[PDB]
Design a protein around this ligand. Structure first.
Ligand SMILES: [Mg+2]
Ligand SMILES: [Mg+2]
Ligand SMILES: [Mg+2]
Ligand SMILES: [Mg+2]
Ligand SMILES: [Mg+2]
Ligand SMILES: [Mg+2]
Ligand SMILES: [Mg+2]
Ligand SMILES: [Mg+2]
Ligand SMILES: [Mg+2]
Ligand SMILES: [Mg+2]
Ligand SMILES: [Mg+2]
Ligand SMILES: [Mg+2]
Ligand SMILES: [Mg+2]
Ligand SMILES: [Mg+2]
Ligand SMILES: [Mg+2]
Ligand SMILES: [Mg+2]
Ligand SMILES: [Mg+2]
Ligand SMILES: [Mg+2]
Ligand SMILES: [Mg+2]
Ligand SMILES: [Mg+2]
Ligand SMILES: [Mg+2]
Ligand SMILES: [Mg+2]
Lengths: 142, 120, 110, 56, 103, 117
RNA sequence: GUAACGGGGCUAAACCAUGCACCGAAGCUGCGGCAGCGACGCUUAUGCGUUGUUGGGUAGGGGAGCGUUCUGUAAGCCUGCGAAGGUGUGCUGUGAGGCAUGCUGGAGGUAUCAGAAGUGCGAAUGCUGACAUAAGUAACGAUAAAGCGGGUGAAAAGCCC
RNA sequence: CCCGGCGAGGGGAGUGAAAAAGAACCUGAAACCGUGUACGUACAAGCAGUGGGAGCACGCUUAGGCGUGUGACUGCGUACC
């Protein structure tokens, strides 16, 4: 007999809301990447996106510990001459604060097509209200 | 060329005389045990005619046989040269391979005496 | 009815001929002839002669009415290659392949 | 200047993909002679835009 | 109602009337077999094993056929060391139809 | 005597190319390359017949851990509860149950809780 | 080009000490099967019932097999109601392989048991024949120069006037 | 008999048991090159497989699905001598 494998035309996905008022970054993106990959559903399948859709708001109000507001540096390279660009945490807060959540989740998610496809289910916003009320989102508590 | 070319080689083995004679003793004993051996006094015909020879083999109910003689008859050898399933030989000129190959073997009684003297 | 015509041992490369054949594969006969007529290449000349041969063979040996006729199958296989010596510099020589083609055109009505 | 591996059928298709012929399919019909020709080009019968030249 | 049991060193969940491939058994073709080492029986209300081997639980089954499985290849190969082997294998199976479930 | 080799060579080559249908290019067409990739396919077959067991077991354990945390307990405490409840149900069947019949799994969790505390 | 945890990331997800769980390999166990070596009884390793044990492996030693060509068995057997070879499929054994058959082919092949080998190819910048590759790329052979009307001709920048 | 240039080559007729035996000629493998159908591929990287596996198209039926062709996605994974 053959053990169950999830089928992408049968997948029942749901929608959730995460308040990010004052939460811890790594410990939050933990639960986020978990719910996006589908490690919480009993019908998990490693090659089928079996997670859910998550809307995280107040992404500007994430907390980190220590001097990571000052000393933790995000680096990226262009591909050019000496094109290494660095930015601190509060520089990312001032520039585009959703990038912190998005890069942390993308790092926790796998590399490749299924990782990017389940990363597509992550919607983050800096404010407190949003334009996605039509999907009947249920509050996630964490 | 060929990597190791061939030469005209003699395939003649060496046969021990006692091994040869014991093989012939055993081969005739096994012919008797297979009941493939018949002994009569006289076997000849006084005309060189394969018609007469084939009629005599029909009267003896014989198909693929081996004739052996005490001494050799002109007309008897002439009547079975042209017959493929039948060879006619002198009692000296024998081979175990044709002793096997032919379905039954018939022997002159004088040839039986010469064979048993020749084996001893 | 499918009607076959072909040209063996044409003195041109099948690579060059399939460039012409890919224009008129599947089209009608009249537009096919017009495209070959106003297409400016050696293989177009050759396949125009082959296609006119196909037209005539279809008209003559079997079912007529050219007006109800479409270009259906066309394929250009490669043929044998004539192997010549070309003298290059410093005493050496190189093989030369005068590549040929088998041009086959099958024409039918429906 | 020479290669180090042998290229493929697939690479040969990817290179010859654009080396493919574009027909004209835009022919024009002369009013007078009642035949067709290339646009701005003359007929074999000395006609162009209705009027007449050599027609040898 | 469905049943979970132990047959060939491999546990199996099954419903009533289902055909299950198993390991080789010494039993004949048309002989009826039973299993009293059942682990789970379920309905709207279920009975699991607390300690194993359900009290009233029994599975009646019928052997349908015996056979040999799909052949698989074994290739062994040491690169640069001048050694390779190959073997072939088919695993013996018995097919059963599960007739009866009882508790 | 002199023996020619064509028929038996063609048989062996044809057998290997039969085993190498569906491969990319010279892997399907050329003996000197197909004979390598079939042996490598044998290596990977000999490896992955083992690795099916690891990969399916970690799939099963993932689904059991997910459904156990749905019913409010961890995988470790759940397996410990089954071993102290003397339960010998394996992870294949538990995964199939935790997919299909949730309530049976919930009752197994409650038995593991009662065996734990 | 961050670049001194693999990474994301962590004030515990780090460190010292303690406990109970869990994961985790081709190790161990469970099932089913093969072979070798013993050790056993009917019986003679022909085998059968267990039971113990072993089974990574280069150079290399030993033991057992398959398949091809030819000779005897073969003036026998198969074959024009279709042989060898070629291409597919299905079945079979641990293995080299075998068996039945469709299509092609159009006249030879050979069971069983023995016998003799030019007896099994991926490699040696191996030899011969064929076929791709760069690729429709470079070049088309002194930079002394060509232009037009007519003719032949299926069609002419080159041929003729 | 027809097309084509009084060609090369071809389609019919026809001989023949056979023309896919038509003079490059018995059989006609492989490399290589085409044509048609089915499936996949245009946000996705690496000895191109293997293992799992969704979907698509056919062939079977005891009609549960066993079979073939394809292989979205995923774990592992650096040819041979
Ligand atoms: Mg990874
Ligand atoms: Mg092929
Ligand atoms: Mg454990
Ligand atoms: Mg294991
Ligand atoms: Mg083991
Ligand atoms: Mg065992
Ligand atoms: Mg060994
Ligand atoms: Mg022969
Ligand atoms: Mg060289
Ligand atoms: Mg060479
Ligand atoms: Mg050019
Ligand atoms: Mg170039
Ligand atoms: Mg150039
Ligand atoms: Mg140039
Ligand atoms: Mg010049
Ligand atoms: Mg002049
Ligand atoms: Mg002619
Ligand atoms: Mg030829
Ligand atoms: Mg021929
Ligand atoms: Mg895409
Ligand atoms: Mg990898
Ligand atoms: Mg070698």
């Amino acid at each position: 007999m053959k053990t169950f494998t999830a089928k992408p035309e049968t997948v029942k996905r749901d929608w959730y809301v995460v308040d990010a008022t004052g939460k811890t970054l790594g410990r939050l993106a933990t639960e986020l990447a978990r719910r996006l990959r589908g490690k919480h559903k009993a019908e998990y399948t490693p090659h089928v996106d079996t997670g859910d859709y998550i809307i995280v708001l107040n992404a500007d109000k994430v907390a980190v510990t220590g001097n990571k507001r000052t000393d933790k540096v995000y680096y990226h390279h262009t591909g050019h001459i000496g094109g290494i660009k660095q930015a601190t945490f509060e520089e990312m807060i001032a520039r585009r604060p959703e990038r912190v959540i998005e890069i942390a989740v993308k790092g926790m998610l796998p590399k490749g097509p299924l990782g990017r496809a389940m990363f597509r289910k992550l919607k983050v916003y800096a404010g407190n209200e949003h334009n996605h009320a039509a999907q009947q989102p249920q509050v996630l508590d964490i | 060329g060929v990597t190791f070319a061939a030469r005209p080689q003699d395939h003649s083995q060496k046969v021990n005389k006692k091994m040869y004679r014991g093989a012939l003793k055993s081969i005739l004993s096994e012919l008797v045990r297979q009941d493939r051996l018949i002994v009569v006094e006289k076997f000849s015909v006084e005309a060189p005619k394969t018609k007469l020879l084939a009629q005599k083999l029909k009267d003896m109910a014989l198909e693929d046989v081996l004739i052996i003689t005490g001494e050799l008859d002109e007309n008897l050898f002439l009547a079975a040269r042209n017959l493929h399933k039948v060879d006619v030989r002198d009692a000296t000129g024998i081979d175990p391979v044709s002793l096997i190959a032919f379905d039954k073997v018939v022997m002159t009684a004088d040839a039986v005496k010469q064979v048993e003297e020749m084996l001893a | 009815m499918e009607t076959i015509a072909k040209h063996r041992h044409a003195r041109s490369s099948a690579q060059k001929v399939r460039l012409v054949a890919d224009l008129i594969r599947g089209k009608k006969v009249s537009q096919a002839l017009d495209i070959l007529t106003y297409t400016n290449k050696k293989a177009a000349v050759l396949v125009k002669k082959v296609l006119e041969s196909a037209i005539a063979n279809a008209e003559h040996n079997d079912g007529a009415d050219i007006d109800d006729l479409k270009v259906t199958k066309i394929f250009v296989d490669e043929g044998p290659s004539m192997k010549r010596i070309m003298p290059r510099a410093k005493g050496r020589a190189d093989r030369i392949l005068k590549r040929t083609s088998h041009i086959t055109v099958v024409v039918s009505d429906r | 200047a020479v290669q180090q591996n042998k290229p493929t059928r697939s690479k040969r298709g990817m290179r010859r993909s654009h080396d493919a012929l574009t027909a004209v399919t835009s022919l024009s019909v002369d009013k007078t002679s009642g035949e067709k020709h290339l646009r701005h080009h003359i007929t074999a019968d000395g006609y162009y835009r209705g009027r007449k030249v050599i027609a040898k | 109602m469905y049943a979970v049991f132990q047959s060939g060193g491999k546990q199996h969940r099954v419903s009533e009337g289902q055909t299950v491939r198993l390991e080789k058994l010494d039993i004949a073709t048309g002989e009826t077999v039973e299993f009293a080492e059942v682990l789970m029986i379920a309905n709207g209300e279920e009975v699991k094993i607390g300690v194993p081997f359900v009290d009233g639980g029994v599975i009646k089954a019928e052997v349908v056929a015996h056979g040999r499985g799909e052949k698989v290849k074994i290739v062994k190969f040491r690169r640069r060391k001048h050694y390779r082997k190959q073997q072939g294998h088919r695993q013996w199976f018995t097919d059963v139809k599960i007739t009866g479930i009882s508790a | 005597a002199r023996v020619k080799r064509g028929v038996i060579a063609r048989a062996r080559h044809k057998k290997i190319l039969k085993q190498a249908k569906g491969y990319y290019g010279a892997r399907s067409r050329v003996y000197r390359v197909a004979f390598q990739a079939v042996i490598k396919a044998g290596q990977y077959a000999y490896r992955d017949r083992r690795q099916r067991k690891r990969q399916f077991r970690q799939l099963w354990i993932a689904r059991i851990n997910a459904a156990a945390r749905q019913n409010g307990i961890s995988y470790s405490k759940f397996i410990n509860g089954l071993k102290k409840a003397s339960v010998e149900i394996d992870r294949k069947i538990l995964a199939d149950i935790a997919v299909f019949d949730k309530v049976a799994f919930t009752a197994l969790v409650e038995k593991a809780k009662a065996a734990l505390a």
